[PDB]
Design a protein around this nucleic acid. Structure first.
Ligand SMILES: [Mg+2]
Ligand SMILES: [Mg+2]
Ligand SMILES: [Mg+2]
Lengths: 143, 189, 104, 55, 57, 121, 75, 145, 72
RNA sequence: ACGAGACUCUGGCAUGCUAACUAGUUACGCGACCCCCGAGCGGUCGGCGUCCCCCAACUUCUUAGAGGGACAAGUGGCGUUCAGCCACCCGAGAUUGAGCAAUAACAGGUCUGUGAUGCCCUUAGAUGUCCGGGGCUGCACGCGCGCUACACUGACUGGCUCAGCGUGUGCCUACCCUACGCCGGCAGGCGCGGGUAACCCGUUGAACCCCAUUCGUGAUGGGGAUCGGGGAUUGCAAUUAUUC
């Protein structure tokens, strides 16, 4: 039976697959993984020091759903509200360097590749492990 | 039979006084799984009477100005606090809700146009819609002022308000204004 | 040819638009052509809103001006040298008309 | 006069270059859809352009 | 061909044409009894028809 | 000293690396065009410096351009800068190189106060 | 009601108090235990999960703002 | 989490030139000194390689001075150039973060040096008025009356 | 739409889809016996909500609300 | 008879009609996927094609034209049993919002909207016009319209998931919206296209909300005023701080 990423809770799934990159450490992490401030509208840089792995888990899942996306599309997805303080809050996109770095990070693992159109999409093997993990979390979640 | 939130069968609740048998809306006919339905229960008159009570309290709780689009949040506030009730007492949250409402529903009020002495001149009995209308309002206001700056949050802050109102102990903020309103009407009879 | 030609039209008033297009559609049928019916786009509404008063004195009243743009297009698979005359014998001075060739 | 400073200041970007196309005024302009008309004159000629007060 | 105007501005461009056209003929044929104009537009050979009360002068 | 580098290296050093010890604003300003108006002011400032007798403060020069940055070249000058009514007198000394001539000639005398009249109910 | 400000990693004297008293009543929330003995509220949920690890308190709610616990079955 | 209060739990400390409270969390306790904010405290904490979940009180002696060396010489301790307070200093030009009563008198240096040069900003600082171009018609009234 | 507006559109659609399938491919005596029970309960499962929204007027921040008038 | 109403636009209903390669939906043929011991018409796909002329049809979804539909119509109750009102059934809808808007009036505002204008003033050391700099912001105070808050119906970090109006490259006029790849922590920068537009931005991956973590009732991880330093963008010029 199954198992795709659609039939598993994405909240638990993204946690599970982020553990996979933590377990199989090959995703090249930039030097600044401790100091990015991570999506300018945000402050107080993320609590989890593995924030690059949960980000990498998250962007991999997102692309599997809506492929053919670039860096600018990634920054919009993770863009949150910027609280201007005394000025009313607005919407601001995430930092481009972190989304750029993770996008190339999946390239070094050969999960994603450039296409004839702008953006990159998961390769056959790239979405293969994503469904293996989706089955892994479901069986753990199911029982 | 309706397993509200997967529990709390409807067909055990009893309501004492004849007046709110017509009004209390916890009967199996309007036995909804959740307190959320945009059913136009305020577009006309007299429809809010048949609107389910569990919808009413979760709809009045959504009121301080800072939380006006939080219906799903108020559904979790009642659904959590209903657990605290059934956890503490073991009987039906639905039952104690109705006992809390009928106990905390003020009957006598004062309203007039002459020279009001203390509140108004003439003591006036309430209709059994404003009675249930007001009674929910004290409960909602009874959790709000307690949960404002306390460590305890609304789930228990509402919870202790109902059980105190249901038994009757003069320590709940809701029933504390109820009898006070009753006696001022008896004062200016 | 045989050419996959398309003819488009656009204006602000619709009563002429319905009749003038149907005139081209009926002209196509009497010419016995493989004719694609009138495909019609969502309308375009221009929403200029203005202060409504020349000076600054008023009760904060405004002026909501509208203009609707409706565009439709027909498609054919008939030779250009045998469809020019029909698209030319219908004028309707209130309308805008554009042509493009089979390969576009 | 002379030609070196008569128009030395640039009528580039800004309110100086822009103006109404009827009254040469530089207040209450409407550049939307390239009108370049002030609000008073636009209300005056609105029917001729085709902006109709539908609702 | 190279620079074509957007349709929204285009219907504005025709609309701003007749507005000023009617304005100038109003100052030009005022004593002649202007009484309005009609611009019979075609893709190439646009024609303008005046509605004067005394066209003879 | 200016940025840990003293005034002696400031006078002889070139424009292509004074941008860095300048702040972002003045670096950007010099990165783009330096027009002919301010070149002449520097030209006239240099002529005033050379025309100053030894151990003598060079003569006052007046200007309208209250938007120039101060350069190491013309430190030690008497520059009169218009504020709209008069040319305010400003002396030039080492520690302004990252400021403007308009920053010193104040364009308004500060208000002391006045007793409220008919308003202020 | 002025200020409490007195909670730093509740000591052994308190320790024995909650370990033999908390599992003997039904309403356990990080807020009430914070009121009950003196607790602040941060180490409250740390205490409840530490008790939850022991297997003597039963969790019923498991929500963000409300983690509701109850005593064991009696008899 | 412990059986009793940790034996060397310091309720008050004497780091630098103030008394940071020990009960508050470490990332928000060290920030109490001038010159460090929420982000500066968090980054220097990571360079110290100490966990965030602990408090300031139980932070033992070794981590007391390990942080101090982090935040007086950030440059050689791999703190980014974008993070410092006194970047490109107006007198010395060293990329350095000032974090003490030094910051109190460094900030005091600007007010006088602008005052000594009679800059419009310094004069407004001297007169107590707003210096960044605000409007004083209907605000700032609480400072005079 | 939004989260809940979508959440109502799903349940509304599947109820109509079931009865439409029931009416077409099996006896609707069964469809009449299923149409009643979900009518006596939450009529919204088939009848769509006809109220969409109300436009904003140029006198206040919203549809019926007005900018606060000050005359003192 | 004018005004009200009627009227026009708009919103809701039509699985009824006309049509959709600038909207698509199913069916199909694939291609990758996954459980596979085999399942198997298992399901995932906003991945591909199905008008280079069938390799399939169709309009449910989207769009917009013609229409229809609602009228106190039906049922009861009240009412002179009149005009109507109340309740109920069936119904998408039993009062959707606007636009227009009479007789007139007011020394209402506008000569600073106009090559609209009477009269007066000025007209070469200009009250014409241009150029440079300042000012319209300037602060013992008072008032109004607002925004942000005074928090644990909450902030913080992380993750999941959703819209609708409408705009977009220029008469003047140079100034458009921008995908993607790379560098930068951000601000941004550099190349590389697309779009005069249901084609590209854009399936508009919006916020709130939702789900996990930390805080713990402390002017506190609220609040973000004032204030220092640094970096970019716009411009010919950013100081009195343009903006970030
Ligand atoms: Mg508003
Ligand atoms: Mg009418
Ligand atoms: Mg500041």
């Amino acid at each position: 039976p199954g198992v795709t990423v659609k039939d598993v809770n994405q909240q638990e799934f993204v946690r599970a697959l982020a553990a996979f990159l933590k377990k199989s450490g090959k995703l090249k992490v930039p030097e600044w993984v401790d100091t990015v401030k991570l999506a300018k509208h945000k402050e107080l840089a993320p609590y989890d020091e593995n924030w690059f792995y949960t980000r990498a888990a998250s962007t991999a899942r997102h692309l599997y759903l809506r492929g053919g996306a670039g860096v600018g599309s990634m920054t919009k997805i993770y863009g949150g509200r910027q609280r201007n303080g005394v000025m009313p809050s607005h919407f601001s996109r995430g930092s481009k360097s972190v989304a750029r770095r993770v996008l190339q990070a999946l390239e070094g693992l050969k999960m994603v590749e450039k296409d004839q159109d702008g953006g990159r999409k998961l390769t056959p093997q790239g979405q293969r492990d994503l469904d293996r993990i989706a089955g892994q979390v479901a069986a753990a979640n199911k029982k | 039979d309706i397993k509200l939130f997967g529990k709390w069968s409807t067909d055990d609740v009893q309501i004492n006084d004849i007046s709110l048998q017509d009004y209390i809306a916890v009967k199996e006919k309007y036995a909804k799984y959740l307190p959320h339905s945009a059913g136009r229960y305020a577009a006309k008159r007299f429809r809010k009477a048949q609107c389910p009570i569990v919808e009413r309290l979760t709809n009045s709780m959504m009121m301080h100005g800072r939380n006006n689009g939080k219906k799903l949040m108020t559904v979790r506030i009642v659904k959590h606090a209903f657990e605290i009730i059934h956890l503490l007492t073991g009987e039906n949250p639905l039952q104690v809700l109705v006992n809390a409402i009928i106990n905390s529903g003020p009957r006598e009020d004062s309203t007039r146009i002459g020279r009001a002495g203390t509140v108004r001149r003439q003591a006036v009995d309430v209709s059994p819609l404003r009675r249930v209308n007001q009674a929910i309002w004290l409960l909602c206001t009874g959790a709000r002022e307690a949960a404002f700056r306390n460590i305890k949050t609304i789930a228990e802050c509402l919870a202790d308000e109902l059980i105190n109102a249901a038994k009757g102990s003069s320590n709940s903020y809701a029933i504390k204004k109820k009898d006070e309103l009753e006696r001022v009407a008896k004062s200016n009879r | 040819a045989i050419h996959r030609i398309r003819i488009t039209l656009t204006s602000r008033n619709v009563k002429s638009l319905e009749k003038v297009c149907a005139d081209l559609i009926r002209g196509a049928k009497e010419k016995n052509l493989k004719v694609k019916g009138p495909v019609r786009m969502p309308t375009k509404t221009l929403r200029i809103t203005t202060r409504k008063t020349p000076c600054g004195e008023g009760s904060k009243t405004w002026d909501r001006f509208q203009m609707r743009i409706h565009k439709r297009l027909i498609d054919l698979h008939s030779p250009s040298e045998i469809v020019k005359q029909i698209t030319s014998i219908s004028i309707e001075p209130g309308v805008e008309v554009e042509v493009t060739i089979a390969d576009a | 006069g002379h030609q070196q400073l008569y128009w030395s200041h640039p009528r580039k970007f800004g309110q100086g270059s822009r103006s109404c196309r009827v009254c040469s005024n530089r207040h209450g302009l409407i550049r939307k859809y390239g009108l370049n008309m002030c609000r008073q004159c636009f209300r005056q000629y609105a029917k001729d352009i085709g902006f109709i007060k539908l609702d | 061909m190279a620079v074509q105007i957007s349709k929204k501005r285009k219907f504005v461009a025709d609309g701003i044409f007749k507005a000023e056209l009617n304005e100038f003929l109003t100052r030009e044929l005022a004593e002649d009894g202007y009484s309005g104009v009609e611009v019979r537009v075609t893709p190439t050979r646009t024609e303008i028809i005046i509605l004067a009360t005394r066209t003879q002068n | 000293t200016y940025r840990g580098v003293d005034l002696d290296q400031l006078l002889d050093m070139s424009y292509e690396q004074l941008m860095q010890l300048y702040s972002a604003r003045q670096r950007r300003r010099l990165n783009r065009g330096l027009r002919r108006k301010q070149h002449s002011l520097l030209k006239r400032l240099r002529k005033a410096k050379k025309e100053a007798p030894p151990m003598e403060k060079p003569e006052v020069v007046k200007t309208h351009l209250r938007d120039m940055i101060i350069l190491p070249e013309m430190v030690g000058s008497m520059v009169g800068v218009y504020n709209g009514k008069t040319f305010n007198q400003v002396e030039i000394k080492p520690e302004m190189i990252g400021h403007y001539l308009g920053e010193f000639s104040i364009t308004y005398k500060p208000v002391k106060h006045g007793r409220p009249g008919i308003g202020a109910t | 009601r002025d200020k409490l400000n007195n909670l730093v990693l509740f000591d052994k004297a308190t320790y024995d108090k909650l370990c033999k008293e908390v599992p003997n009543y039904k309403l356990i929330t990080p807020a009430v235990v914070s009121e009950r003995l003196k607790i602040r509220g941060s180490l409250a949920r740390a205490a409840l999960q530490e008790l939850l690890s022991k297997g003597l308190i039963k969790l019923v709610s498991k929500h963000r703002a409300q983690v509701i616990y109850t005593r064991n079955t009696k008899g | 989490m412990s059986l009793v209060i940790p034996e060397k739990f310091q309720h008050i400390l004497r780091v630098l030139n103030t008394n940071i409270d020990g009960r508050r969390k470490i990332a928000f306790a060290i920030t109490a000194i001038k010159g460090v904010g929420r982000r500066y405290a968090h980054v220097v904490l990571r360079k110290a390689d100490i966990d965030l979940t602990k408090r300031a009180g139980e932070l033992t002696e070794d981590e007391v001075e390990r942080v101090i060396t982090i935040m007086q010489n950030p440059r050689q301790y791999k703190i980014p150039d974008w993070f410092l307070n006194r970047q490109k200093d107006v007198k010395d030009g060293k990329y350095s973060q000032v974090l003490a009563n030094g910051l109190d008198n460094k900030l005091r240096e600007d007010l006088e040096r602008l005052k000594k040069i009679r800059a419009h900003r310094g004069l407004r600082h001297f007169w107590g008025l707003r210096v960044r171009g605000q409007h004083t018609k209907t605000t700032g009234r609480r400072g005079r009356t | 739409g939004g989260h809940v507006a979508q959440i109502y559109a799903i349940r509304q659609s599947i109820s109509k889809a079931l009865v439409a399938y029931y009416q077409k491919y099996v006896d609707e005596a069964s469809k009449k016996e299923i149409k009643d029970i979900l009518i006596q309960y939450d009529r919204t499962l088939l009848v769509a909500d006809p109220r969409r929204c109300e436009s904003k007027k140029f006198g206040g921040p919203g549809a019926r609300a007005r900018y606060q008038k000050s005359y003192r």
